[PDB]
Write an enzyme that holds these catalytic residues in place. Structure first.
Site, PDB file in Angstrom:
ATOM      1  N   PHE A 421       3.074   5.823   4.695  1.00  0.00           N
ATOM      2  CA  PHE A 421       1.641   5.843   4.931  1.00  0.00           C
ATOM      3  C   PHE A 421       1.238   5.718   6.392  1.00  0.00           C
ATOM      4  CE2 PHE A 421       2.819   1.516   3.530  1.00  0.00           C
ATOM      5  CZ  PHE A 421       2.394   0.743   4.593  1.00  0.00           C
TER       6      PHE A 421
ATOM      7  N   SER B 389      -6.221   2.846   2.170  1.00  0.00           N
ATOM      8  CA  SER B 389      -5.861   3.463   0.895  1.00  0.00           C
ATOM      9  C   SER B 389      -4.459   4.029   1.070  1.00  0.00           C
ATOM     10  CB  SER B 389      -6.842   4.550   0.489  1.00  0.00           C
ATOM     11  OG  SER B 389      -6.377   5.224  -0.665  1.00  0.00           O
ATOM     12  N   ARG B 390      -3.447   3.252   0.693  1.00  0.00           N
ATOM     13  CA  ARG B 390      -2.080   3.704   0.903  1.00  0.00           C
ATOM     14  C   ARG B 390      -1.484   4.363  -0.322  1.00  0.00           C
ATOM     15  NH1 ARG B 390      -3.307   3.748   6.026  1.00  0.00           N
ATOM     16  NH2 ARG B 390      -2.841   1.809   7.160  1.00  0.00           N
ATOM     17  N   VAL B 391      -1.976   4.027  -1.506  1.00  0.00           N
ATOM     18  CA  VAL B 391      -1.500   4.680  -2.713  1.00  0.00           C
ATOM     19  C   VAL B 391      -2.113   6.066  -2.833  1.00  0.00           C
ATOM     20  CG1 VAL B 391      -1.089   4.258  -5.151  1.00  0.00           C
ATOM     21  CG2 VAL B 391      -1.395   2.374  -3.612  1.00  0.00           C
ATOM     22  N   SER B 393      -3.115   7.834  -0.209  1.00  0.00           N
ATOM     23  CA  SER B 393      -2.466   8.610   0.835  1.00  0.00           C
ATOM     24  C   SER B 393      -1.125   9.128   0.332  1.00  0.00           C
ATOM     25  CB  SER B 393      -2.256   7.770   2.091  1.00  0.00           C
ATOM     26  OG  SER B 393      -1.276   6.776   1.865  1.00  0.00           O
TER      27      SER B 393
END
Ligand code: ATP
Ligand code: ADP
Ligand code: MG
Ligand code: MG
Lengths: 542, 523
Positions: A421, B389-391, B393
């Site tokens: 990420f 928002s890493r999920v 992404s």
């Protein structure tokens, strides 16, 4: 069949009272409930006094009637342990929740035992190299130590505990146990799938070549299941330590959840509340659990535990009790994370028993104490730098602020689990490169470079590699004018030609909602049950 | 008075019966003359012993399940929370002023449930599934429990599909995966529902363009909100057409606190119909901080011990067991999803509060809405440095992923050099490029309300801004230049970006070309 089979006396949430007409079960014994939709076991918590035991449900109690037959098993909750539990996911009571069949149990151990005795303790300090700059320098971990990661909801305890699985838990040649206590279910599935693709968990006939066993009691579980699933994770880790006799890596995510789940239960057990509404038995419940997670003279457990702090409050009854139980405490801060520094480790709040001149050497120790002396004297200046600015500082103090802003950025590094990420690839930094790198910034060898050359880089070779890239791009900012791949004829079809290559999608227009749906007949009246259990409409009075 | 001494009173030890037989010939004549003063006895029914504080203590009810819908003779529902040895304490889903001591409590025989199905789509229900829109009962529907356990580890997969919000700041910088939870957290009056309303209106525009399996059926849950705001929202959904795909669960500020505590579970059960049948859900819990206040009321009135902020201690499990039901299911369970957007109201920007930090450690990311960016007119006031928002992404639009990596980059430097220049006296002219590009991109990201933008018209507008094509316009006409870019550029280039998913080099050249023949209003 009648005696040693009690009946449900009263249900208050997760707490069930069972009355046994004779031969009460012992405290910590597990009790099965007959006729429930799922398997509901109850761990006996108290003897109430009138042939009644007070119990804690390991599943939901929605559906319990006050006559339900309850069978005593004569023993505590007993979970499968051994080399056959590797590569499997268990819940609190040892059932496989991964749909891979039954668990090949070498033994069936109860999850309740005492700590190893004082004669069983091992007093040996060798370092655990993690590849993290701020960890290996300031608060270095012990290879059989208890390690606590202290965090405040979003500061990065799970990314840090997932990087330690990436760095430490592959070079470490033993077994790993991941006890997921009250965390997200998605993370559990993500960690389960990232271990299968890494070969740490092998499925099928190759299951015996797995190196990790997972015990998951996540945050959808009732508070009885989250209060005991840490004990299920120790019992798997204690079999590999006591019986198999090897070095285990125990990762507990959100150890505070075990304390919080006992605090949801202690209100219903009729206990006067302690400070901050916590259960009075907060130090001995956590104490009786943490004293089992040790290295004995027969085996080793290196425990990494993420500790959640409730309102960014380190003086809260549940983080504050955990601090005495750990050999190394990595305190992650929110203000460090808001400056973009990741891992957000507070350098002046993290502490290791390992940071001793004799244990890690005098060259390593004097760099860490010199890094902390610069960062502390800079913290003493921040009240004036905020008000008066840096113009009113002495230039002896300006060299402090210039060096401390450099080592603050240099403690951060990119993680190999965070590149999915952040985009920046992750850097494992050897211990000799962090001691060499931070000593140069302390003596003054790198005052030439700017602050942002130290931000998100592996070692001091890469600060110089990044100070050039920053310098190089202060000249190059333009010259993308002509001579492109973007002109008219060279690689490019017509724009209306590209529209015909779009495959048309048929939209079925009917939403597909009544495909297999059965619709029960909702009545015009409230349907209830009369005194004879018959489906009767609601009578007309009030 | 030990228990060994009282069970000796089981066996008879009188050997003298001169008043056992005397009252046995006089008891039944004595009971018979007091029969109109006896209430009829009660074993499987219930009778209210005590009612008050929204909790009734019910004598009888010998066979209630724990957590079961009980019905009073006034027609009001309850839930049997604690079965005790002598009574059963129920919590009243409604007004406790209509329940009296002596009232009959009936058993429905079913743990607390709401109608779910296709026929609850389009309707405005209360916190228990009873419709309040006035257009009849719920037909084509079936009952399902409101306290279903979340799917486990093996019943899930990772989020892959990109669930476009239609908000420019959201779908570019904090993009939302389709089985993800995303907290919308901010102060009062910061456009919290505005971001969640624009997500719901946007699915109406996309459901009529996707082939029946990629359709998102939204559910809006209002807890503690005024009835007028809820009624003004059903009017907005009806007039945009978004009510065809939306369920509206409403527990307003006048409703009972057990109806507001239960309303997110009632709405999650209705949205779980689409998750469990292979469709896709979207649920918004507007003011989940008001659902914890309603649950704090029921716990304090049940005399449960206060907590850190006087909350019950199980207020984490209140929200964790709720938001764990928003999952992306695996292929053997249908592949359905449920996307949650909880909303937390923050007092004076303090995100270190108890309920705020609880939902942050439950959800997958946050959408921070700053009250100082909202006062400056930057709306949606997305705190870019804190919103995560890493999920979602590496699950977003592939064409937006190319053009927004530099958008987050040029905004990361913009916050660095605005922190370094808190006042204007020092001008470097290499950071003035960042102050002119950062103020360019901020004006690009702000959009007006109830007009969500498709993802192909949102990728091009950031393509026209992270690259050149807008350095002519100063800062003011960029909102006019964005609609000048979107209207004047050929709409056949939006079909290629949509169908291919990303900016091909065949389209990268054409869209550099079409962005040079745009009449920019700043000249
Ligand atoms: N992008 C926007 N542009 C202009 N006005 C906006 C925008 N978003 C929201 N608003 C308006 O700002 C006001 C506050 O926004 P909104 O009601 O969505 O915030 P909220 O967080 O739900 O606040 P509350 O605590 O009152 O519920 C409303 O009048 C709304 O219409
Ligand atoms: N090491 C890191 N590098 C980059 N971003 C990070 C890092 N740790 C945390 N973050 C950011 O902060 C969030 C919190 O990380 P996580 O460990 O999941 O949270 P918590 O510490 O609350 O359990 C991540 O989703 C990410 O956006
Ligand atoms: Mg976490
Ligand atoms: Mg609102």
């Amino acid at each position: 069949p009648a005696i040693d089979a009690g009946y449900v006396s009263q249900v208050i949430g997760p707490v069930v009272d069972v009355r046994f007409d004779g031969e009460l079960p012992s405290i910590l014994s597990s009790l099965e409930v007959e006729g429930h939709s799922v398997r509901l076991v109850l761990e006996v918590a108290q003897h109430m006094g009138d042939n009644t035991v007070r119990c804690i449900a390991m599943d939901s109690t929605d559906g319990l009637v006050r006559g339900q037959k309850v069978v005593d098993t004569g023993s505590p909750i007993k979970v499968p342990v051994g080399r056959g539990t590797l590569g499997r996911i268990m819940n609190v009571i040892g059932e496989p929740v991964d749909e891979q069949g039954p668990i090949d149990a070498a033994d069936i151990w109860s999850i309740h035992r005492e700590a190893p005795e004082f004669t069983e303790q091992s007093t040996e300090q060798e370092i655990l190299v993690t590849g993290i700059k701020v960890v290996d320098l300031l608060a270095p971990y012990q290879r059989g130590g208890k390690i606590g990661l202290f965090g405040g909801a979003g500061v990065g305890k799970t990314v840090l505990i997932m990087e330690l699985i990436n760095n430490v838990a592959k070079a470490h040649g033993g077994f790993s146990v991941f006890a997921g206590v009250g965390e997200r279910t998605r993370e559990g599935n993500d960690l389960y799938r990232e271990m299968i693709e890494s070969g740490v968990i092998k499925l099928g006939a190759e299951r015996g070549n797995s190196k990790c066993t997972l015990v998951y009691g996540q945050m959808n579980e009732p508070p009885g299941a989250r209060a005991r699933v840490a004990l299920t994770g120790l019992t798997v880790a204690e079999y590999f330590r006591d019986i198999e006799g090897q070095d285990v890596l125990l990762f507990v995510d959100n150890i505070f959840r075990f304390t919080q789940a006992n605090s949801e239960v202690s209100a219903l057990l009729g206990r006067i509340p302690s400070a901050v509404g916590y259960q009075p038995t907060l130090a001995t419940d956590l104490g009786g659990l943490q004293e089992r997670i040790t290295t004995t003279t027969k085996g080793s457990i290196t425990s990494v535990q993420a500790v959640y702090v409730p309102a960014d409050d380190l003086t809260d009854p549940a983080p504050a009790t955990t601090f005495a139980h750990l050999d190394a405490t990595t305190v992650l801060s929110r203000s460090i994370a808001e400056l973009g520094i990741y891992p957000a480790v507070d350098p002046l709040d993290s502490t290791s028993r390992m940071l001793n001149p004799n244990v890690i050497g005098a060259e390593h120790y004097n760099v860490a104490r010199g890094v902390q002396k610069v960062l502390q004297d800079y913290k003493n200046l921040q009240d004036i730098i905020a008000i008066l600015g840096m113009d009113e500082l002495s230039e002896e103090d300006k060299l402090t602020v210039a060096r401390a802003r450099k080592i603050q950025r240099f403690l951060s590094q990119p993680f190999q689990v965070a590149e999915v990420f952040t985009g920046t690839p992750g850097k494992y930094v050897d211990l000799a490169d962090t001691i060499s790198g931070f000593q140069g910034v302390l003596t003054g060898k790198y005052d030439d470079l700017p602050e942002m050359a130290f931000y998100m880089v592996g070692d001091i070779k890469e600060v110089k590699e990044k100070a050039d890239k920053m310098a190089k791009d202060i000249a190059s900012r333009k010259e993308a004018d002509n001579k492109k791949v973007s002109e008219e004829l060279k690689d490019i079809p017509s724009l209306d030609k590209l529209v015909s290559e779009i495959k048309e999608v048929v939209i079925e227009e009917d939403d597909g909602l009544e495909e297999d749906f059965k619709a029960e007949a909702l009545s015009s009246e409230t349907v209830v049950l009369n005194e004879e259990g018959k489906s009767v409409p609601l009578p007309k009075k009030n | 008075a030990d228990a060994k001494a009282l069970d000796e009173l089981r066996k008879p030890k009188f050997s003298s019966k001169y008043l056992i037989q005397h009252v046995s010939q006089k008891l039944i004549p004595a009971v018979k003359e007091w029969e109109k003063s006896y209430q009829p006895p009660v074993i499987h029914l219930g009778r209210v012993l005590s009612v008050g504080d929204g909790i009734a203590r019910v004598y009888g009810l010998k066979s209630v399940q724990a957590g079961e819908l009980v019905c009073f003779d006034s027609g009001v529902k309850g839930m049997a929370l604690n079965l005790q040895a002598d009574h059963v304490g129920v919590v009243v889903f409604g007004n406790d002023s209509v329940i009296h001591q002596g009232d009959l409590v009936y058993r429905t025989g079913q743990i607390v449930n709401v109608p779910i199905g296709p026929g609850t789509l389009g309707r405005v229900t209360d916190g228990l599934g009873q419709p309040i829109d006035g257009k009849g009962p719920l037909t084509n529907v079936r009952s399902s429990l409101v306290e279903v356990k979340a799917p486990g580890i093996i019943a899930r997969q990772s989020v892959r599909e990109p669930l476009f919000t239609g908000v420019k700041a959201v779908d570019a910088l904090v993009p939302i995966g389709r089985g993800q939870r995303e907290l919308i957290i901010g102060d009062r009056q910061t456009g919290k529902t505005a971001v969640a309303i624009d997500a719901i209106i946007h699915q109406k525009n996309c459901n009529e363009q996707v082939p029946k399996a990629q359709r998102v059926y939204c559910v809006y849950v209002a807890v503690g909100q005024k009835r007028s705001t809820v009624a003004q929202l059903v009017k907005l959904f009806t007039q945009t057409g978004a009510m065809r795909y939306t369920i509206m669960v409403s527990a307003t500020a006048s409703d009972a606190a057990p109806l507001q505590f239960l309303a997110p579970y009632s709405g999650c059960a209705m949205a779980e119909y689409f998750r469990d049948t292979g469709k896709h859900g979207l649920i918004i819990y507007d003011d989940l901080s008001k659902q914890s206040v309603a649950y704090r009321q029921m716990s304090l009135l049940l005399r449960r011990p206060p907590g850190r902020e006087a909350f019950p201690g199980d207020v984490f499990y209140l929200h964790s067991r709720l938001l764990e039901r928003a999952a992306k299911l695996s292929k053997e369970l249908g592949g359905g999803s449920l996307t949650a957007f909880p909303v937390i109201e923050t007092q004076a920007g303090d995100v270190s509060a108890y309920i705020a930090t609880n939902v942050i450690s439950i959800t997958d990311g946050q959408i921070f809405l700053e009250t100082e960016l909202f006062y400056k007119g930057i709306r949606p006031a997305l705190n870019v440095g804190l919103s995560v928002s890493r999920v979602g992404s590496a699950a977003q639009f592939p064409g937006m992923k190319q053009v927004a990596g530099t958008l987050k980059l040029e905004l990361a430097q913009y916050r660095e050099v605005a922190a370094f220049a808190q006042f204007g006296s020092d001008l470097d002219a290499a950071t003035q490029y960042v102050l002119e590009r950062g103020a360019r991109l901020t004006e690009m990201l702000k959009q007006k309300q109830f007009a969500p933008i498709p993802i192909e018209r949102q990728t091009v507008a950031v393509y026209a801004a992270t690259k050149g094509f807008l350095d002519k316009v100063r800062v003011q006409d960029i909102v006019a230049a964005e609609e000048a870019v979107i209207s004047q550029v050929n709409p056949a280039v939006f079909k290629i970006l949509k169908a291919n998913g990303k900016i091909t080099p065949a389209l990268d050249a054409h869209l550099k070309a079409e962005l040079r023949k745009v009449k920019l209003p700043g000249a």
